[PDB]
Design a protein around this ligand. Sequence first.
Ligand SMILES: CCN1CCN(c2ccc(C(=O)Nc3[nH]nc4cc(-c5cccc(OC)c5)ccc34)cc2)CC1
Length: 289
Amino acid sequence: LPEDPRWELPRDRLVLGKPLGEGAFGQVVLAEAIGLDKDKPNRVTKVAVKMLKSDATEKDLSDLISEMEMMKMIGKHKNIINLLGACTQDGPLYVIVEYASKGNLREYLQARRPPEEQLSSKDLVSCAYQVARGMEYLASKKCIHRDLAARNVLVTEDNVMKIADFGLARDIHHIDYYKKTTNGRLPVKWMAPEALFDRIYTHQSDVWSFGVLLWEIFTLGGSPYPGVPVEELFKLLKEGHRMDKPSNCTNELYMMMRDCWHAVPSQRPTFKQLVEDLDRIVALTSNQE
Ligand SMILES: CCN1CCN(c2ccc(C(=O)Nc3[nH]nc4cc(-c5cccc(OC)c5)ccc34)cc2)CC1
């Protein structure tokens, strides 16, 4: 691998630890990095580190490299998982990124269902706002996520939402529609119809996904279309079926979901608009329940 002084960290500055993400994101571990920022060489920073597996092919390597290079191009934002460094010389590839100590957004929501303090209505809307901001940023940098979902949003120690796994151009025609997530759910249930049927991925189809994620948030981690298999989902979408309004969700926010699921992609809102709408809604939403 060619060295890149912008990002290189000597690998003896890294203390490796336990796995993260239950394999969903490949081999990612928690680590401690000494002197990440060279201004404070004596501080340690908890970071996430992604690396190849033992039984890994040549393209597994090129993919990890592409992922890293992509993250370099995209630049930094508060509501995405940022690149922090790399170990590329004299050993196996390490990609060093921000650590989100509270796991993914689906888990985090579920753990705060009534029987871990319950979330206020304002908290929930604020969660939506942060995810829209990260996506607004990524879209502005010409990045299409293709798998936006609460499982790919990570939460920091300070309850900041970060979009994860935006760096890989995953093998588009090559996707297993029947393959389930780590949780046992079907990723097709987040996909816009034109992405699912015509394999056309855009910022507009990411917005569809965001509507489903919105529905995840206000159901506190609910599973979309529970019990519905792939073939039946296809039929549902061909018919123009839409998920019902969650309880404890305003008509305004349900209308937002429905707009994100506009049958005509050009008519869906942009992440720019969603951020603006969500920003106003936050300021009017009570945190007293
Ligand atoms: C109450 C019980 N809780 C306790 C906390 N716990 C968890 C669970 C999971 C995490 C976690 O995965 N954190 C992560 N932070 N940053 C992360 C980056 C990637 C990542 C992804 C793609 C590409 C990449 O590099 C190129 C990296 C992955 C995972 C990451 C933390 C706490 C759950 C249960």
